[PDB]
Design a protein around this ligand. Structure first.
Ligand SMILES: CNC(=O)C1(N2C[C@]3(CCN(c4cncc5ccccc45)C3=O)c3cc(Cl)ccc3C2=O)CC1
Ligand SMILES: CNC(=O)C1(N2C[C@]3(CCN(c4cncc5ccccc45)C3=O)c3cc(Cl)ccc3C2=O)CC1
Ligand SMILES: [Cl-]
Lengths: 305, 306
């Protein structure tokens, strides 16, 4: 019993974190095989950040301008190139701790673990979701750029996020490991803002199933609804639309608990229209949306890595 | 910016997790140097759990009755002994991944990371706090016994908890790494229950300071309180008494934000009276109590967003 915001074990990722320094800028890099990946803004001064020409800034750098430190060992940079908003530094040593990995681009609503890092050293691990507005509600300070997000499947690490910046509302923006931003953001210090966000409906339903599995059933009722009527109510409360794919994905949970997905949608409609009336669900007074259906099944089954 | 329930990176602990089996019973063990530590109830069948005589059960076992598996390698047990509610199995190989470590017994209110494990394999990591009633609100299934709790301040792992059982309310009980239970619990299937729990006042105050550091002050008020009048109110809401030690511990957060501890206590008294009126503090609609003053200093910026 119990239900916690749980991250994947971070060990396989800790063995890949290094420190990258270019002049006065020090940030984190990810060392896989003989390449270190890091945000391309490592080559920028504060003035360059106002309107950078990354190719022009990069041509003025030699391999020796990049100082890469893995623990207490200096790695020799033997090549450099840019891929979108990521800098790839070829080093003369393959990381002996390189795990089995893939680079994957995730969709809004998907969750992942973040290994927050400073000066190439891991400081903490926490669970995040890619918001519908393509930001993440992380916990990051200056020096955290280059920290990565990931999931694990069996023995394979799927890297999905690299940290680049913090927006004025204190939320975070970054790229996939191919340097493509999530959201309409750019790696420049120009006026940028998080758009209006929405709640991830399929995840709230998954968390209501987790509550039922754990014994919280007060919110259940005799009613059901249709997908169309439910989506009219979701649009009204700034919830994302629920699709037939989301209904199908929740199938196993509907079968285990005996509560149909549209039966749980009727519980969610009543919760939106009435509130909790002083009650809590899994120790929360808000409807939680950062657990996917897969996260709920995994935590309630004890899958190991 | 931001404020999350943040665990320590689990790598140093993952490299210590092993599987321990005695007959049909299997659970997790912690392998440090040449010793594997695990709950002593690995020597019990379900039929032994009501009134187990651990000394009588253990004397009937040889070293070779204990099967220890580290990854896909079988370790050889060359000695065994019981210390309180833990079993210590001496093995013929020192763990090459043993980190720098210490065993620390913590007090209620303290937080730690848990590496949930099954069959010697890590499944996830999360933050926990030792409740005032000496239980932890973990997330554990059958097979999780032997999973540990720890902190990693300054590169040394401080192991503080080893998981033993789940109480009828779904909360968890366990021991320090010397096998001494936290709370009045025993490793028996006899009727046991968590006592009435309370909210960790010093941690709620630390989290209110985290919110001020992160740029929010909506909950503050023009009032102050004496420590005794604050305790008289807080106890009516089932909050733990705030001591002068807790006031002293909050000194650094008070200095960083410019809000005296007793002035933050007045804010907390008002929040307990009024609720949040549709507002949230650090993304929560409830007053959070599983962040210590030390955790706030660890995670938050050293510069308040004024
Ligand atoms: C809040 N940011 C800032 O004050 C500044 N900034 C800096 C930066 C790099 C570091 N960084 C941060 C990343 N995560 C957390 C943070 C916390 C507190 C300060 C910074 C942080 C950035 O955002 C950056 C990167 C890119 Cl690709 C584009 C623009 C910026 C940027 O605007 C200084 C001006
Ligand atoms: C909830 N517990 C149980 O149903 C039973 N039980 C078993 C056990 C060992 C495993 N275990 C669990 C530990 N964490 C999570 C769990 C989740 C779900 C089942 C069990 C779990 C225990 O509690 C145990 C150990 C000790 Cl030292 C003392 C008593 C017990 C005990 O009562 C079976 C009867
Ligand atoms: Cl302590």
């Amino acid at each position: 019993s119990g239900f916690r915001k749980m991250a994947f074990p971070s060990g396989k990722v800790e063995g890949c974190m290094v420190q990258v320094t270019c002049g006065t800028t020090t940030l984190n890099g990810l060392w896989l095989d003989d390449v270190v990946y890091c945000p391309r803004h490592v080559i920028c001064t504060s003035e360059d950040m106002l309107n950078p020409n990354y190719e022009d800034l990069l041509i003025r750098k030699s391999n020796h301008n990049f100082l890469v430190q893995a623990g207490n060992v200096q790695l020799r940079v033997i090549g450099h190139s840019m891929q979108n908003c990521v800098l790839k530094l070829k080093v003369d040593t393959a990381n002996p701790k390189t795990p089995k990995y893939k680079f994957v681009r995730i969709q809004p609503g998907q969750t992942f673990s973040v290994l927050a890092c400073y000066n190439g050293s891991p400081s903490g691990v926490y669970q995040c979701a890619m918001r519908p507005n393509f930001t993440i509600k992380g916990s990051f300070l200056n020096g955290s750029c280059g920290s990565v997000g990931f999931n694990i499947d069996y023995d394979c690490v799927s890297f999905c996020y690299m940290h680049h910046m913090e927006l004025p509302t204190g939320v975070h923006a970054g790229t996939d490991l191919e340097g493509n931003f999530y959201g309409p953001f750019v790696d420049r210090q120009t006026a940028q803002a998080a758009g209006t966000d929405t709640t991830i409906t399929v995840n709230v339903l998954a968390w209501l199933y987790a509550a039922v599995i754990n014994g919280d059933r007060w919110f259940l009722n005799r009613f059901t609804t249709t997908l169309n009527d439910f989506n009219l109510v979701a649009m009204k409360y700034n919830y994302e639309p629920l699709t037939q794919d989301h209904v199908d994905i929740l199938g196993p949970l509907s079968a285990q608990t005996g509560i149909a997905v549209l039966d749980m949608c009727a519980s969610l409609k009543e919760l939106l229209q009435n509130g909790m009336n002083g009650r809590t669900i899994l120790g929360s007074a808000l409807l939680e949306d950062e657990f996917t259906p897969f996260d709920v099944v995994r935590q309630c089954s004890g899958v190991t890595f």
